[PDB]
Structure 1
Amino acid sequence: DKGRFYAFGRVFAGTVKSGQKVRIQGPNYVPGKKDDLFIKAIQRVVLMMGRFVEPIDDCPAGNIIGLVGIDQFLLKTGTLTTSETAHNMKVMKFSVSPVVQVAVEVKNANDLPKLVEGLKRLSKSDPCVL
């Protein structure tokens, strides 16, 4: 669909329950002052399988689980926690930094929102064009 991506992830500590207040911490977040720390709760929890949604209310720690109620806050990576000083993990070092560049234009009408939402879609789909 359009902009309803389910966020794949891995749970290490705590049992994730659908419909729970969640404090999302981004890479720029620090435990000292204000950052991109939002208190938006998670809508539900969906199990990952062969292209179909499996609703699950709760899931314990130590597993790998994707969640729904995200993708309009985060950009590339992040962590969702509830502790007041939950430190973020190390920054992932990508394989190859962008080198080759091209100029993208369009000869059609003012489809700027379509192109920007498309590039956002690629950006969220994989470590694609920044």
Structure 2
Amino acid sequence: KKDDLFIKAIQRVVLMMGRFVEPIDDCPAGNIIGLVGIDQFLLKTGTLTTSETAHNMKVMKFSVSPVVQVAVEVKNANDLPKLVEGLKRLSKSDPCVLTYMSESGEHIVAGTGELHLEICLQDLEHDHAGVPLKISPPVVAYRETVESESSQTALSKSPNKHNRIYLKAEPIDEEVSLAIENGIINPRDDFKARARIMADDYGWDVTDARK
């Protein structure tokens, strides 16, 4: 597949010695070497080759996973887009942190531990952003569910006071709930086809499955 293959070149080659950096004309195999010009399109890890038949080295599991979460938000509504980009900038800088947006519409940085959060806050304070940040414990995405088979058939008179809607509420089998997300019971499926597969393999009646 043509996925994520970047046909580019090299801007400069550098061998590092302390903070000083110098251009390099060529570097043979089996050597530590640095280089520029690909940092913008790089994903903080990967394989660099001059061919498509070569393969990608195994993704380092890090053996240490980014787990601890803390929210991050902007001081000003006008300032929201300015330092929202810096999340990607820091994510490149360290090969573990994964900046994303949580299910609460809120941006979460996930670190390995406590002080790994410490290292990535002064850069947002000073280096990768200038605006201060409000740092708060993360908000989690709960949800509300029932199992207790609501007795009275619910009903609500429409604003016209002409129509009403009768209805009932009751639970769902847990594997069905997974299957709704897992796509086995898929809205893209035909109503007929999806009704057959959910009525027999999973506990359902063909009458309701067709509805």
The bucket for the TM-score relative to the shorter chain is 0.5 to 0.7
Note closer, same or farther for the CA distance 1:100–1:54 as it changes in structure 2 (3 Å cut): same
The answer to whether residue 18 in structure 2 is matched with residue 53 in structure 1 is no
User: Which residue does the alignment assign to 2:56?
Assistant: 88
Note closer, same or farther for the CA distance 1:102–1:63 as it changes in structure 2 (3 Å cut): same
TM-score (norm 1): 0.66
User: Which residue does the alignment assign to 1:35?
Assistant: 3
Note closer, same or farther for the CA distance 1:37–1:103 as it changes in structure 2 (3 Å cut): same
- Calculate percent identity across the aligned residue pairs: 100
**TM superposition outliers: structure 1 runs of 4+ over 6 Å:** none
The answer to whether residue 50 in structure 2 is matched with residue 98 in structure 1 is no
Name the SS of the counterpart of 1:45 in structure 2: strand
User: Which residue does the alignment assign to 1:116?
Assistant: 84
TM-score (norm 2): 0.43
Name the SS of the counterpart of 1:97 in structure 2: coil
| Shift in Å, 1:106 | 1.8
User: Which residue does the alignment assign to 2:34?
Assistant: 66
| Shift in Å, 1:109 | 4.5
Structure of higher RCO (CA pairs closer than 8 Å, 6+ residues apart): 1
Name the SS of the counterpart of 1:81 in structure 2: coil
Name the SS of the counterpart of 1:108 in structure 2: coil
Q: 1:122·1:128 contact (CA, 8 Å) conserved in 2?
A: no
User: Which residue does the alignment assign to 1:23?
Assistant: none
| Gapped regions of structure 2 (runs ≥ 5) | 99-211
- Partner Cα separation in structure 1 for residue 29 and residue 80 of structure 2: 42
Name the SS of the counterpart of 1:121 in structure 2: helix
| Gapped regions of structure 1 (runs ≥ 5) | 1-32
- Partner Cα separation in structure 2 for residue 46 and residue 102 of structure 1: 37
User: Which residue does the alignment assign to 1:12?
Assistant: none
- Partner Cα separation in structure 2 for residue 76 and residue 95 of structure 1: 17
- Partner Cα separation in structure 1 for residue 37 and residue 84 of structure 2: 22
Q: 2:14·2:21 contact (CA, 8 Å) conserved in 1?
A: yes
Note closer, same or farther for the CA distance 1:52–1:114 as it changes in structure 2 (3 Å cut): farther
Aligned pair count reads 98
Aligned AA (2:4): D
Aligned AA (2:37): G
* Bigger CA radius of gyration: 2
Q: 1:46·1:67 contact (CA, 8 Å) conserved in 2?
A: yes
Q: 1:46·1:66 contact (CA, 8 Å) conserved in 2?
A: yes
The answer to whether residue 94 in structure 2 is matched with residue 126 in structure 1 is yes
